[PDB]
Write a protein that binds this ligand. Sequence first.
Ligand SMILES: O=C(Cc1nn[nH]n1)N/N=C/c1ccc(Br)cc1
Ligand SMILES: [Cl-]
Ligand code: NA
Ligand code: NI
Ligand SMILES: [Zn+2]
Length: 331
Amino acid sequence: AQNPNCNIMIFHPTKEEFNDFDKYIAYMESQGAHRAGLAKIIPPKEWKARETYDNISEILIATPLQQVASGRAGVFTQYHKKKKAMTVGEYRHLANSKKYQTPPHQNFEDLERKYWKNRIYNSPIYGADISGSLFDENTKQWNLGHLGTIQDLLEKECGVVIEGVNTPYLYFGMWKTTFAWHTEDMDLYSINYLHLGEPKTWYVVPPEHGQRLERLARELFPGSSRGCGAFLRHKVALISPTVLKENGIPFNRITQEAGEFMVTFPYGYHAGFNHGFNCAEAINFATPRWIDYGKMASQCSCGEARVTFSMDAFVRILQPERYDLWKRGQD
Ligand SMILES: O=C(Cc1nn[nH]n1)N/N=C/c1ccc(Br)cc1
Ligand SMILES: [Cl-]
Ligand code: NA
Ligand code: NI
Ligand SMILES: [Zn+2]
């Protein structure tokens, strides 16, 4: 059995191997990559996402989100306070201001220590979930706006057409901006490209151990857990690596740099933070192996999560017994 310790694997596809996206995902899984929950893919040297990033300052961040924490340094929740719109150029200047800029640090490990020590005492502002793409239309390999759709995957595997569309999102980050512990909607895969700027550090729990993280989260956030049997779906809970280690939770960590892709696998819980000003693009996707995870994925029906139009058909077809309750939670 490949990758039995569930380590994060790093791949260096050649230009030929970079042509067929689905085939390379399958290849990584044949090597056990999915057991970690996350893999890094370094594109071949001949590849580029677009020519330059010199002309992005006029993109609008319609609803920047200030991420306000509550709790303790290693066990906290965050809520998103809406701020006034600003352009990417204005956001970059804000990220680099004294209030928000990355502090002096010696290496990624020093910055990680500073993050977990000090995150709760600041409220960084995040450009998240902006529909759009920065891939050039002429980039034919690993273009996140040109992947096969999840709707087409479900039709190919299970035989029925469904409504819905699947498009990418942009994320503009700054120091301390945080993504809470979660799996993807319907336990889908995700792919993430860091277009420009400073790194993003990731933490991940192997899919085979995801229930261990859920159990700890219920213990550490007891009111939240009483409110919703799938409250991690709300994407607001943070637990530090120190607390995970103290509780024996299996996990790994890795830092992504500009020009690198990360793939998260079905039911791989992940969380992390941005080191400084950056821009990432991400989208969910499916493969034949996802179907069984989609059929079993937990759902939030308490109201909080209230997700995409496209999730309706996935619940409707893959989880008919749960559909009516889930739908009540969306309205
Ligand atoms: O601004 C910072 C460091 C920072 N200090 N505090 N927060 N971040 N790096 N920017 C990098 C960058 C790369 C490519 C393009 Br295009 C535009 C900007
Ligand atoms: Cl700090
Ligand atoms: Na490990
Ligand atoms: Ni995610
Ligand atoms: Zn809920």
